[PDB]
PDB file of C-alpha atoms in Angstrom:
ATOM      1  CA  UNK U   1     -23.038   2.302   8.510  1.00  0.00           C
ATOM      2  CA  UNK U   2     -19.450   1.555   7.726  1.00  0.00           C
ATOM      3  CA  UNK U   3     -19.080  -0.229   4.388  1.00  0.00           C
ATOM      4  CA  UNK U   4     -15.354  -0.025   3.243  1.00  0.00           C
ATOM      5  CA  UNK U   5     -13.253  -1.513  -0.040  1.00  0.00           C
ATOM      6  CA  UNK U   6     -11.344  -4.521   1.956  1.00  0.00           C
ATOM      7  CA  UNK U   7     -11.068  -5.258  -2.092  1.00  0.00           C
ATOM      8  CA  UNK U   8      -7.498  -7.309  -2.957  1.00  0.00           C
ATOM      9  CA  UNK U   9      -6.138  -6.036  -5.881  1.00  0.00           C
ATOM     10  CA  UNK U  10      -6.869  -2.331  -5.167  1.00  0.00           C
ATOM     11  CA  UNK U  11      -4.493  -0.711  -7.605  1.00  0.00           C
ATOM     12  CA  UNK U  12      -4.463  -3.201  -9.966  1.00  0.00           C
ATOM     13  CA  UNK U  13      -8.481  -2.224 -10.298  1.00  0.00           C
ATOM     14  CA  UNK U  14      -7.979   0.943  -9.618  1.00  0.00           C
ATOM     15  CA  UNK U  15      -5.548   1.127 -12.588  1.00  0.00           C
ATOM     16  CA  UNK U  16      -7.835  -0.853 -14.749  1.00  0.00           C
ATOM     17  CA  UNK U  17     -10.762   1.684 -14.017  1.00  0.00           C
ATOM     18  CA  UNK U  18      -8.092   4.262 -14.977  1.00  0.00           C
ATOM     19  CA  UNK U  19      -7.408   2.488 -18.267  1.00  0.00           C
ATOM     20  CA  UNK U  20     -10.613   2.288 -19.193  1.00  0.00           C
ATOM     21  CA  UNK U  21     -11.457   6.402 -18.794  1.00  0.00           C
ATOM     22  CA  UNK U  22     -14.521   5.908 -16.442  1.00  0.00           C
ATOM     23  CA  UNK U  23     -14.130   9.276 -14.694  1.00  0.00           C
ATOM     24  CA  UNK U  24     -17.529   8.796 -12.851  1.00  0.00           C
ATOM     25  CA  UNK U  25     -16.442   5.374 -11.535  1.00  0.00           C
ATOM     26  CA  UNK U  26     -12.747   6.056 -10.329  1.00  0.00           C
ATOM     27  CA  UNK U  27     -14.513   9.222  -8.564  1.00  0.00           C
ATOM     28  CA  UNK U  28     -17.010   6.682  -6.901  1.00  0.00           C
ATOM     29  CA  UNK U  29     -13.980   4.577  -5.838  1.00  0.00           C
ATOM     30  CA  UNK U  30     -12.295   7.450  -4.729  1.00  0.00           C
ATOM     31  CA  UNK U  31     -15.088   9.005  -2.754  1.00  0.00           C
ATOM     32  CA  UNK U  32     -15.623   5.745  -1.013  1.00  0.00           C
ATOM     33  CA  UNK U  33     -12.510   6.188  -0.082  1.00  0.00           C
ATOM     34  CA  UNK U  34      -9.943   3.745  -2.317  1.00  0.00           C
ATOM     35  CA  UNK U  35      -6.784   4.296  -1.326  1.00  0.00           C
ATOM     36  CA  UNK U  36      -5.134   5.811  -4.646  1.00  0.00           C
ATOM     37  CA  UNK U  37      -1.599   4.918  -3.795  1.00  0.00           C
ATOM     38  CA  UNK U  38      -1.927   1.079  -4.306  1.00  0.00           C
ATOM     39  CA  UNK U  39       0.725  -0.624  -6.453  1.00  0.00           C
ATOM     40  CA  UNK U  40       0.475  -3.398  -9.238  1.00  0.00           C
ATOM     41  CA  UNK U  41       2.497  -6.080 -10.709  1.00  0.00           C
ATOM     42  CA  UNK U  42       4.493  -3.501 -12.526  1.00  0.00           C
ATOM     43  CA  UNK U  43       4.465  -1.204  -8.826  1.00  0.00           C
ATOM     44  CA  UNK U  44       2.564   1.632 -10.780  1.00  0.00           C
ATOM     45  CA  UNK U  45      -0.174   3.798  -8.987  1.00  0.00           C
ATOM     46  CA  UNK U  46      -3.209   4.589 -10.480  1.00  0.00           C
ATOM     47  CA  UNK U  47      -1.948   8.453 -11.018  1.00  0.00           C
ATOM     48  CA  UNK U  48       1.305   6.515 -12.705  1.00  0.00           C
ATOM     49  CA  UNK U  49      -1.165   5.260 -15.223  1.00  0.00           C
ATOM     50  CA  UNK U  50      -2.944   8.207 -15.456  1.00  0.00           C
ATOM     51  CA  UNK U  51      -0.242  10.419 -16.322  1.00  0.00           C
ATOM     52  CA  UNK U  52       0.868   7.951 -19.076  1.00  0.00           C
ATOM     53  CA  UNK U  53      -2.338   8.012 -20.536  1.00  0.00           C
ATOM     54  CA  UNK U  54      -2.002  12.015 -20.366  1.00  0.00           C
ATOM     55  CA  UNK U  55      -5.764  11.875 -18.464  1.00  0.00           C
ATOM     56  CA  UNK U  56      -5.525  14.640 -16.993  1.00  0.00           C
ATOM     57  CA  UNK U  57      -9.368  14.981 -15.120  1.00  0.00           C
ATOM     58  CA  UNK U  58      -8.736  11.370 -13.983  1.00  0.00           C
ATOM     59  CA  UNK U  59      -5.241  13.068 -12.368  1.00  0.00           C
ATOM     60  CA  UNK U  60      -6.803  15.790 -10.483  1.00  0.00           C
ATOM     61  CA  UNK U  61      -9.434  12.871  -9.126  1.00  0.00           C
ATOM     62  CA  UNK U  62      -6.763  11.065  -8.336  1.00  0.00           C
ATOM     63  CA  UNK U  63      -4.688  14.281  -6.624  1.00  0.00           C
ATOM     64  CA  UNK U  64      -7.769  14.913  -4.530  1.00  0.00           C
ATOM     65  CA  UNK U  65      -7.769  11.313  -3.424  1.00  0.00           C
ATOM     66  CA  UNK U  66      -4.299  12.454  -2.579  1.00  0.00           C
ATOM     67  CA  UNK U  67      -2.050   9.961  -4.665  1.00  0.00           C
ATOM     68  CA  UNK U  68       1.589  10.288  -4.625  1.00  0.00           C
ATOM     69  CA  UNK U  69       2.788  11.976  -7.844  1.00  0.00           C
ATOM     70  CA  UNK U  70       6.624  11.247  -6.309  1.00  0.00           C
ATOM     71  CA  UNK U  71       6.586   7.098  -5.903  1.00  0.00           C
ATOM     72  CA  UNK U  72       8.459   5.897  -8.108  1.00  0.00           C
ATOM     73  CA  UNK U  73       7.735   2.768  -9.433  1.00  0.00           C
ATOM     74  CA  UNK U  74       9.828  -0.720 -10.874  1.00  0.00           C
ATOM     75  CA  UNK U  75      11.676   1.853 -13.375  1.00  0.00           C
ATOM     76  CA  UNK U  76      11.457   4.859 -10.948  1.00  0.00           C
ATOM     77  CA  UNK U  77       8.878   6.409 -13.388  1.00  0.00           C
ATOM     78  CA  UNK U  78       7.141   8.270 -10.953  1.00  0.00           C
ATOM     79  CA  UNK U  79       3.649   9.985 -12.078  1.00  0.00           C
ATOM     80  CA  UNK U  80       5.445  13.306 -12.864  1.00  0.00           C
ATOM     81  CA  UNK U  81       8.105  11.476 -15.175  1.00  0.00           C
ATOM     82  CA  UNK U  82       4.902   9.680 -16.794  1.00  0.00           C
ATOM     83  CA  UNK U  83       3.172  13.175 -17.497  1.00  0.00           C
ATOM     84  CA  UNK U  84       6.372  14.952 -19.079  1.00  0.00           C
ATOM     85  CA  UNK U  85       6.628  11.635 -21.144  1.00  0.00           C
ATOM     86  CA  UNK U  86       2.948  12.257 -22.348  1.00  0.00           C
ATOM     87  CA  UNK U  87       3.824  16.038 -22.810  1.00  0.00           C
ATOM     88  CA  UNK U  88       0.241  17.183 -21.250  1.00  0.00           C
ATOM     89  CA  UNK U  89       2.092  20.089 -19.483  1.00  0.00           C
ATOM     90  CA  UNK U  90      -1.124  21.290 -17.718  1.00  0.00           C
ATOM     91  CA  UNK U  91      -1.427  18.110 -16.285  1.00  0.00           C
ATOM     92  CA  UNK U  92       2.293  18.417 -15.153  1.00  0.00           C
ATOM     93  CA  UNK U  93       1.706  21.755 -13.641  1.00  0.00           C
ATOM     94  CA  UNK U  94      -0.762  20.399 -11.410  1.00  0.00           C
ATOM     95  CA  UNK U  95       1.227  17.729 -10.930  1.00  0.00           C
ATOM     96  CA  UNK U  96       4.371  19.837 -10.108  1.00  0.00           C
ATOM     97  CA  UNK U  97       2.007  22.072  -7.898  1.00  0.00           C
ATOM     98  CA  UNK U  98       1.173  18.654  -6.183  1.00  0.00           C
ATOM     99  CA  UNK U  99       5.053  17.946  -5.837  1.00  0.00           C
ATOM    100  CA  UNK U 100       5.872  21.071  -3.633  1.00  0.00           C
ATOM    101  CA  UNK U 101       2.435  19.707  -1.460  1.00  0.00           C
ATOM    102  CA  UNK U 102       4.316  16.783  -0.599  1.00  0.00           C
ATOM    103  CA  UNK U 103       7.456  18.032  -0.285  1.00  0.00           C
ATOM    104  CA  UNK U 104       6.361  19.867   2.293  1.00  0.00           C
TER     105      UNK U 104
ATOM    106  CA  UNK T   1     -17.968 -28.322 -25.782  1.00  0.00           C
ATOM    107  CA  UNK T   2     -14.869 -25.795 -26.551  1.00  0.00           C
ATOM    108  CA  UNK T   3     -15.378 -23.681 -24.105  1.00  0.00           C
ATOM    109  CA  UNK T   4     -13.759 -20.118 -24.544  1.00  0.00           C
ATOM    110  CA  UNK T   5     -12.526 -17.582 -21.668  1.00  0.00           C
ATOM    111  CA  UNK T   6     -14.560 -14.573 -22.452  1.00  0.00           C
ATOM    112  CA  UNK T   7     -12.642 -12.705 -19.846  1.00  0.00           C
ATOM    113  CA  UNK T   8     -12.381  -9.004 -20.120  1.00  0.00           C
ATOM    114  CA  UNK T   9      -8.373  -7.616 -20.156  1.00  0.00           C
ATOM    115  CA  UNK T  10      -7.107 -11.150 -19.760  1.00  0.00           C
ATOM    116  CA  UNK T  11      -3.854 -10.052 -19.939  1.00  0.00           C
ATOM    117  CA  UNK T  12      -3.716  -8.131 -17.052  1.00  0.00           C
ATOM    118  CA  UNK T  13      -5.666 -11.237 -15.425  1.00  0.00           C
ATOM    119  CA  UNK T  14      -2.523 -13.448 -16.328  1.00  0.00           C
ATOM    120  CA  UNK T  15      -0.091 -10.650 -15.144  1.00  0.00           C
ATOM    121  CA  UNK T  16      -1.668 -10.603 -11.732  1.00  0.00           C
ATOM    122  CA  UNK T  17      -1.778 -14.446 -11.608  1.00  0.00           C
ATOM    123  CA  UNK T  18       1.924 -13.687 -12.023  1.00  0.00           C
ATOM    124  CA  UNK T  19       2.092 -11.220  -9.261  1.00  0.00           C
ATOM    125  CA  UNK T  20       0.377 -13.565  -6.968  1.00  0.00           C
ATOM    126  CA  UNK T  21       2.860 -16.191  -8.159  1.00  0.00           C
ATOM    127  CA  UNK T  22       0.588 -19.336  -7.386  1.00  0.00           C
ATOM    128  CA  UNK T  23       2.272 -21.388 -10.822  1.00  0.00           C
ATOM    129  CA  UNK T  24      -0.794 -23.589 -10.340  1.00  0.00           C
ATOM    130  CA  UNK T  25      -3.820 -21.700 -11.413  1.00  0.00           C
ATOM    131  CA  UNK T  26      -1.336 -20.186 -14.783  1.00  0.00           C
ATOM    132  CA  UNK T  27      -0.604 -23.586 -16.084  1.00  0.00           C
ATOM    133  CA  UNK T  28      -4.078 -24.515 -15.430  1.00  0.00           C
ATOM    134  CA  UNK T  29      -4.903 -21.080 -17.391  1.00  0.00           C
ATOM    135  CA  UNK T  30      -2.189 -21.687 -20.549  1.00  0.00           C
ATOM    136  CA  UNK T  31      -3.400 -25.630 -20.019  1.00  0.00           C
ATOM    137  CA  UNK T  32      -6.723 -24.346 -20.930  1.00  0.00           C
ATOM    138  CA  UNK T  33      -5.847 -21.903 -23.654  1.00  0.00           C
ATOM    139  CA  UNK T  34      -6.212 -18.429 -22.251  1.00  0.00           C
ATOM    140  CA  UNK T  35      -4.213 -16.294 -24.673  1.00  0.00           C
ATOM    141  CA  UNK T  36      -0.263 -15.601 -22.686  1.00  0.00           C
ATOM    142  CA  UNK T  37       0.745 -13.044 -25.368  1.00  0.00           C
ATOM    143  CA  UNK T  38      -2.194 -10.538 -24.547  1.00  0.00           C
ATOM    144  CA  UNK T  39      -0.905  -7.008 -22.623  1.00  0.00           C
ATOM    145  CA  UNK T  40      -2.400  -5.217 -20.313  1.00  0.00           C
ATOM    146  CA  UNK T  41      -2.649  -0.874 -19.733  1.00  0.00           C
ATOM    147  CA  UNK T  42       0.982  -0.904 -19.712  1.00  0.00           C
ATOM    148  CA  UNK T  43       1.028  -2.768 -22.908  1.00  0.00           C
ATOM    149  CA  UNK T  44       3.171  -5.068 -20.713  1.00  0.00           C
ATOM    150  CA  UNK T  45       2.573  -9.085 -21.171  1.00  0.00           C
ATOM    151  CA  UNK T  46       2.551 -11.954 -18.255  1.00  0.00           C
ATOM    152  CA  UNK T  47       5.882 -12.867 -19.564  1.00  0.00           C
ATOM    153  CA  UNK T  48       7.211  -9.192 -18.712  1.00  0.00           C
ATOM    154  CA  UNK T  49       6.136  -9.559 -15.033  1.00  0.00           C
ATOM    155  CA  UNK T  50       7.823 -13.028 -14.986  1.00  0.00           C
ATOM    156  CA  UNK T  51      10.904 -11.797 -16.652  1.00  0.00           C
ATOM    157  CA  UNK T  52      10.674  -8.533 -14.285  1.00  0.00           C
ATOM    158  CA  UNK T  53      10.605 -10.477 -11.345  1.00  0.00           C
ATOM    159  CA  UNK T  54      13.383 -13.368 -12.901  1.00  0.00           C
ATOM    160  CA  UNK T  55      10.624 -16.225 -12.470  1.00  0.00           C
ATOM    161  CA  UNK T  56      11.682 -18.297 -14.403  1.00  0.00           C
ATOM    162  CA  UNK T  57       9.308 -21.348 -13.668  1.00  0.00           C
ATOM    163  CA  UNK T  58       6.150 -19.423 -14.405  1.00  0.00           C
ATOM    164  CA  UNK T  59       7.938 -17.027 -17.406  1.00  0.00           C
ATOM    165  CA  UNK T  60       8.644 -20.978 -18.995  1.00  0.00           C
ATOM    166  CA  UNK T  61       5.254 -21.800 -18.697  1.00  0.00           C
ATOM    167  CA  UNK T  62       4.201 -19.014 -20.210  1.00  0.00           C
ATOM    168  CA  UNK T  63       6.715 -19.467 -23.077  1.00  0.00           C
ATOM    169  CA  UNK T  64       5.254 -23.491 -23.686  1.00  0.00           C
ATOM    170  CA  UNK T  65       2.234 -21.406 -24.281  1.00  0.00           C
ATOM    171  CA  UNK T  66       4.007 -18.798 -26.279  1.00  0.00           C
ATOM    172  CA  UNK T  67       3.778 -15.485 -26.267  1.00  0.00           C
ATOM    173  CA  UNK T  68       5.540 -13.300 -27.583  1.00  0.00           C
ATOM    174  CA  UNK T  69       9.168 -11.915 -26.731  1.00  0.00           C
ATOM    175  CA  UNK T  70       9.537  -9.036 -28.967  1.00  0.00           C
ATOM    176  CA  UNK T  71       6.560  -7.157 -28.097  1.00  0.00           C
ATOM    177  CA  UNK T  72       7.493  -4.082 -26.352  1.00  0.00           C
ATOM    178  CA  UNK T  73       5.714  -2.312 -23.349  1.00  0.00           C
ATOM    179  CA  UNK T  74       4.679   1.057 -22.125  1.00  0.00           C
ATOM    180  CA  UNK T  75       8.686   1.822 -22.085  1.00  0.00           C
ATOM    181  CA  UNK T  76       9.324  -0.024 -25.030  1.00  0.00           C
ATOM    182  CA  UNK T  77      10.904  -3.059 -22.756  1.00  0.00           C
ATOM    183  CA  UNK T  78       9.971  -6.600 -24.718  1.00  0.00           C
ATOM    184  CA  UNK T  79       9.837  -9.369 -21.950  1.00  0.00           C
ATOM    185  CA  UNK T  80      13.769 -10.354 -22.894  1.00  0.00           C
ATOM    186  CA  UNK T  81      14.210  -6.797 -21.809  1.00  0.00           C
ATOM    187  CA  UNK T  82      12.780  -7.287 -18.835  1.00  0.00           C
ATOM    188  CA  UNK T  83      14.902 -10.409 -18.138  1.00  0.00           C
ATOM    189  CA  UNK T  84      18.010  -8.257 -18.887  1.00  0.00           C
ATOM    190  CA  UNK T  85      16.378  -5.613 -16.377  1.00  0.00           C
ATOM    191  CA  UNK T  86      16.000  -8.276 -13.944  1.00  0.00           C
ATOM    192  CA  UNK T  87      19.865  -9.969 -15.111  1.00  0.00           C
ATOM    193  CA  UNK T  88      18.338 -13.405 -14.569  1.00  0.00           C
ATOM    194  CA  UNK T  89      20.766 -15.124 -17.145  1.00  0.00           C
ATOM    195  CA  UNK T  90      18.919 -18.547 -16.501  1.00  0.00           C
ATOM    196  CA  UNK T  91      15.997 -16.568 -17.784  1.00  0.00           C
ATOM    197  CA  UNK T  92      17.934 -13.970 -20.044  1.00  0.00           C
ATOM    198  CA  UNK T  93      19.172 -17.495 -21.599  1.00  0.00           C
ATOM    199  CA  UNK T  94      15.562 -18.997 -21.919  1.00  0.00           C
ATOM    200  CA  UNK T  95      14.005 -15.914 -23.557  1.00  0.00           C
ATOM    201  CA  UNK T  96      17.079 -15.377 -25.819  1.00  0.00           C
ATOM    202  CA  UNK T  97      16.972 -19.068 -27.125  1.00  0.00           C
ATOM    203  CA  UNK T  98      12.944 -17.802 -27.297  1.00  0.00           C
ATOM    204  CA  UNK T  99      14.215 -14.976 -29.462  1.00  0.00           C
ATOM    205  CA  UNK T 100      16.327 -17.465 -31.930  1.00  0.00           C
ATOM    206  CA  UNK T 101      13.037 -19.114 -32.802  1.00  0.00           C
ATOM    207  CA  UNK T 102      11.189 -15.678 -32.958  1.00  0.00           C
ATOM    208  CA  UNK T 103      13.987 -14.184 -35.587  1.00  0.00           C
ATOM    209  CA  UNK T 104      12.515 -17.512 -38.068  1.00  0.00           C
TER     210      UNK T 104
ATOM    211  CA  UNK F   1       5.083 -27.784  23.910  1.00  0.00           C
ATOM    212  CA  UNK F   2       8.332 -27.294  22.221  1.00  0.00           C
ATOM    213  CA  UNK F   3       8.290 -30.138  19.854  1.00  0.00           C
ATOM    214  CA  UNK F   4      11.158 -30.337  17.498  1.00  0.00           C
ATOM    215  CA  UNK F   5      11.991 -32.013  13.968  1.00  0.00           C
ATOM    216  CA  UNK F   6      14.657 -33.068  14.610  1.00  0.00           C
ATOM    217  CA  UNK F   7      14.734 -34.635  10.798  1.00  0.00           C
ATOM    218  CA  UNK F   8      17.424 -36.851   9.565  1.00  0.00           C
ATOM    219  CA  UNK F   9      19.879 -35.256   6.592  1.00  0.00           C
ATOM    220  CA  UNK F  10      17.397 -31.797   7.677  1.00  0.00           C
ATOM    221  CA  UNK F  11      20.178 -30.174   5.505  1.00  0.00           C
ATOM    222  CA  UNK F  12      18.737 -32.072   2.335  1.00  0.00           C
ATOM    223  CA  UNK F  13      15.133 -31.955   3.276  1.00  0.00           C
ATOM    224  CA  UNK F  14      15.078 -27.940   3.164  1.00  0.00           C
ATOM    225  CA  UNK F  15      16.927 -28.113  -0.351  1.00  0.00           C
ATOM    226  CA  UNK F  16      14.336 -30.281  -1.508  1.00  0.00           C
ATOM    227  CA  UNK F  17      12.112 -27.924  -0.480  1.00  0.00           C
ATOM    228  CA  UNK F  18      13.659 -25.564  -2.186  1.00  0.00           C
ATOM    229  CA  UNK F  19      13.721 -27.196  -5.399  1.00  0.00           C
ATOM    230  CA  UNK F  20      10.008 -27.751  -5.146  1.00  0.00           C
ATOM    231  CA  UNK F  21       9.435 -24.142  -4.970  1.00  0.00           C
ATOM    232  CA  UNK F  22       6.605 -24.460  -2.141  1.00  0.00           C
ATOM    233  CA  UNK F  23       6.810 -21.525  -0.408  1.00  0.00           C
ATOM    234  CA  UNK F  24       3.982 -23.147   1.689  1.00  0.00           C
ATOM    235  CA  UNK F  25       6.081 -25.537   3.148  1.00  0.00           C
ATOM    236  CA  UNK F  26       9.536 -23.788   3.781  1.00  0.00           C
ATOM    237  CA  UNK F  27       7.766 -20.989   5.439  1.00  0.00           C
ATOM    238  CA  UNK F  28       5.764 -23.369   7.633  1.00  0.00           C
ATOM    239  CA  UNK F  29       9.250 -25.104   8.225  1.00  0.00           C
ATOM    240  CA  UNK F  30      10.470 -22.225   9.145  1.00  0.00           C
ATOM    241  CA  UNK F  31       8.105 -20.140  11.395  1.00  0.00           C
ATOM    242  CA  UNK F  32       7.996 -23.841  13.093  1.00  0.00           C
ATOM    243  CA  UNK F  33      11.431 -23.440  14.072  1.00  0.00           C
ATOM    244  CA  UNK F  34      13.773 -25.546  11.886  1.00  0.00           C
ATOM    245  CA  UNK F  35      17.415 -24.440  11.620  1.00  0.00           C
ATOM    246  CA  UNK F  36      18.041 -22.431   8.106  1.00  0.00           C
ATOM    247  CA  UNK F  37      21.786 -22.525   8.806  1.00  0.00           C
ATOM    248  CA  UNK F  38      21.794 -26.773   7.904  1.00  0.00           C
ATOM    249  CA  UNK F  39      23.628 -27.607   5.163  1.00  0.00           C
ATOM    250  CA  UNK F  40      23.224 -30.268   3.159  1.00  0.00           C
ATOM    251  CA  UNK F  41      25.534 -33.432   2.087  1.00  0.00           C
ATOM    252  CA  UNK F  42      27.517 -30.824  -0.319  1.00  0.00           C
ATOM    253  CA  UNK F  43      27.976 -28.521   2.813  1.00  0.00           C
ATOM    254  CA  UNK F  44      25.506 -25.979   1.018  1.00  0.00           C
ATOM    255  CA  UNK F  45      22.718 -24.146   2.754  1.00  0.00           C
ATOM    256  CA  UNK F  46      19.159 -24.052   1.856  1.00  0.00           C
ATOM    257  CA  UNK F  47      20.042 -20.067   0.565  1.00  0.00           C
ATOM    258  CA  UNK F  48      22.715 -21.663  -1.764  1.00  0.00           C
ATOM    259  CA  UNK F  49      20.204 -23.715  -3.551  1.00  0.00           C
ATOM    260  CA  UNK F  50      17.385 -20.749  -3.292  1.00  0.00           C
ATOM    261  CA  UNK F  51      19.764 -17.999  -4.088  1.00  0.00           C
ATOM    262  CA  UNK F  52      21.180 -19.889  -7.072  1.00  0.00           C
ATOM    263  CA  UNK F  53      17.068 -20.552  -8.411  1.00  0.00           C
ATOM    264  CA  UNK F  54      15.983 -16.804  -7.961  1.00  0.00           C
ATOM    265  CA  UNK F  55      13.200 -17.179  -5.578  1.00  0.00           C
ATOM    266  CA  UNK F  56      13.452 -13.969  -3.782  1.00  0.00           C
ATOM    267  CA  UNK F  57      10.677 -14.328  -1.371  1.00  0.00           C
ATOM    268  CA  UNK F  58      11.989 -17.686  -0.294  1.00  0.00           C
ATOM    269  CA  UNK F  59      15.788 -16.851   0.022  1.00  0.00           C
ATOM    270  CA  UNK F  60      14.520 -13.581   1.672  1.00  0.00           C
ATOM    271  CA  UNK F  61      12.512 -16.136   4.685  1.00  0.00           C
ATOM    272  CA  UNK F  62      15.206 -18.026   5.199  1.00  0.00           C
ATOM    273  CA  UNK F  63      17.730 -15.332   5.991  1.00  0.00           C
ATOM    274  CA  UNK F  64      15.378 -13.568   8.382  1.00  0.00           C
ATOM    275  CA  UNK F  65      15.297 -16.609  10.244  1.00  0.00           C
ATOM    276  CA  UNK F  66      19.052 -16.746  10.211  1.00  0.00           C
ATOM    277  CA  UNK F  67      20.686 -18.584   6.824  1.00  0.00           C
ATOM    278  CA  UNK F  68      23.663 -16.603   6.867  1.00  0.00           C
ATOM    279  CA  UNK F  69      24.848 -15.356   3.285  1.00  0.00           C
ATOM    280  CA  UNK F  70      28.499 -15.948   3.807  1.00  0.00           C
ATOM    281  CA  UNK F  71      28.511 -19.538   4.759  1.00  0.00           C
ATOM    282  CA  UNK F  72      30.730 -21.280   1.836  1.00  0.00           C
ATOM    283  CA  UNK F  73      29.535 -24.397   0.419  1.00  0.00           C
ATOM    284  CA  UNK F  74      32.058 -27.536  -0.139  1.00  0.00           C
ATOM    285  CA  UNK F  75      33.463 -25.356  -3.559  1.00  0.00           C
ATOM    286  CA  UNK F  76      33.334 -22.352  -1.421  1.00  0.00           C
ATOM    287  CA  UNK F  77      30.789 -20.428  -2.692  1.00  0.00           C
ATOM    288  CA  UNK F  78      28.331 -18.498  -0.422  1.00  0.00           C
ATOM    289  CA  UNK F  79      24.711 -18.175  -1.037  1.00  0.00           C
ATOM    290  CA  UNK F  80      25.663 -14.716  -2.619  1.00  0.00           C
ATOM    291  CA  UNK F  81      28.297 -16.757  -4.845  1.00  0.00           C
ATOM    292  CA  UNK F  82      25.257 -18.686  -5.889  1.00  0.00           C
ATOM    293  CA  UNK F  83      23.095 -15.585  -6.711  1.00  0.00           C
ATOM    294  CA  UNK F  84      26.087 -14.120  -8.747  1.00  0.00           C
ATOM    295  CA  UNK F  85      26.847 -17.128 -10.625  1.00  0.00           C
ATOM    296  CA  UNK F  86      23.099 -17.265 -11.668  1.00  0.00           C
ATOM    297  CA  UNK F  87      20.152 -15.274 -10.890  1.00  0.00           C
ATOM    298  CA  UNK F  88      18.479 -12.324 -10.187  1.00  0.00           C
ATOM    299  CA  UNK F  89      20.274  -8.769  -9.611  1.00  0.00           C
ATOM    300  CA  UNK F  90      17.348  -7.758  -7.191  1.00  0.00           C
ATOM    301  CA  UNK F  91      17.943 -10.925  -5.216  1.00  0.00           C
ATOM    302  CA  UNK F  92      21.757 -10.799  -5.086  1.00  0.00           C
ATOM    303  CA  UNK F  93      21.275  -7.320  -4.064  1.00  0.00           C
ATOM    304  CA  UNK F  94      18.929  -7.753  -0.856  1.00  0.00           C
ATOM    305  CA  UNK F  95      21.255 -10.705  -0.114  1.00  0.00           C
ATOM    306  CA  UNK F  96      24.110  -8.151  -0.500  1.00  0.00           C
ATOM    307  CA  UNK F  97      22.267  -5.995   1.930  1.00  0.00           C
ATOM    308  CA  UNK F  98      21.701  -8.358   4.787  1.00  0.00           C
ATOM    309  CA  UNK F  99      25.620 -10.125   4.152  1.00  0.00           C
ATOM    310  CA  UNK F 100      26.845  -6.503   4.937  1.00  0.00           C
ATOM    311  CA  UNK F 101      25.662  -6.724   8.228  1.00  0.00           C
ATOM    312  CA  UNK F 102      26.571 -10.671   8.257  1.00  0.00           C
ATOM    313  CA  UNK F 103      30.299 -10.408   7.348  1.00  0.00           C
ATOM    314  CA  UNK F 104      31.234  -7.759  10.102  1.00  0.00           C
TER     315      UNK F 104
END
């Protein structure tokens, strides 16, 4: 029928959801369609939080979504400066993989 | 009756009363009690979205609550640090008198 | 039907708005049509008193609807002068910005 997530806030519950580590719920969100690129207070996307956590199965959620690993945020931390700070490099691989995507 | 918040991540709640800047429902919050010093994900307190953004109406209501100045964030940036990022020396000089009571 | 304020000391009536930090008002003010560029008794622009304050979002209005950033106040100091002598680096920056277009 149509229903879409007009919901204020978006990354700011969208990074909460993140926080929290329910996969199954940030992939409902995200097959709804929530737009994973959404800022917060702190300008930080959902994959931003997610590569500081080091979740990497939220990431690939997230990359499939399509967030931007590349925005930078209030610091310029962008989500592939959060993941070499965790040190998951699998999660930066897919990451860096995701990098070239946009790039290009 | 001493009613109590009871509201999940009120940090972050207090952050993005921050964000939306509307002073009136945060000193209605701190008037109430809600807890100022409490982070958020990015470990990251009201005051450091205040002192990020150099608002330094709501970042002094915050501090007649109190909450504290020393406690770092995500990047290890305490809310004075995040004055100093945002170089607002009326605020840089609030939080630092802040700090003189926090060294006692 | 092209009514007009037309306000007394109009200079002083936007700094007070200023001081009372409702963004409300100024930006009703503004999109209404009142003049950003009237100074007040001390010769100083409603961006002297905003710039000097910090609040980004209000300085930012009133130079889109014209409050130039190089007008000099009765000490000669612009609204930039009053971002520089205290406020927010973010602030003096985007005033910076628009001021380089302004000057030349």
């Amino acid at each position: 029928e149509g229903a879409s997530f007009n919901l204020e806030d978006s990354g700011n519950f969208l990074c909460t959801t993140v926080a929290k580590g329910d996969s199954d719920f940030l992939k409902r969100l995200l097959s709804s369609g929530m737009n994973p690129n959404s800022e917060d207070y702190d300008h930080r996307t959902p994959l931003h939080v997610a590569a500081s956590e080091g979740l990497f199965l939220m990431a690939k959620m997230l990359v499939e979504a399509g967030a931007s690993v590349i925005s930078k945020d209030r610091w310029g931390n962008s989500p592939l400066d959060e993941a070499r700070l965790c040190g998951n490099k699998k999660l930066i691989k897919l990451l860096e993989d995701v990098k070239n995507a946009q790039s290009s």
